[PDB]
């Protein structure tokens, strides 16, 4: 059983049959952790609320969609 470590809660995530995906969901904290580089023209952004977002490379600021969050994330 191939495993990667959750970036948020550090539980192990079983990635069997999921190695074609870019990100995988943790069964403990329910957040996502990447297993591949973001697609070209995109970039991963981790919100302080723990959400893994996918942004365009042309974005300096990212609004989180989480309803309890709605943080504006400044990337530079």
């Amino acid at each position: 059983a191939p495993m990667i470590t959750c970036r948020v809660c550090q539980s192990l995530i079983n990635v069997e049959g999921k190695m074609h995906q870019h990100v995988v969901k943790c069964g403990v904290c329910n957040e996502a952790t990447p297993i591949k580089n973001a697609p070209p023209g995109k970039k991963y952004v981790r919100c302080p609320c723990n959400s893994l977002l996918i942004a365009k490379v042309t974005s300096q600021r990212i609004a989180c969609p989480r309803p309890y969050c709605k943080r504006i994330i400044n990337l530079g």
Binding site: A32, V45, A55, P65
Partner: peptide, 10 residues
Amino acid sequence: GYTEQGQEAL
């Protein structure tokens, strides 16, 4: 240097 609505990777 733009602002975008974040999309969940999930």
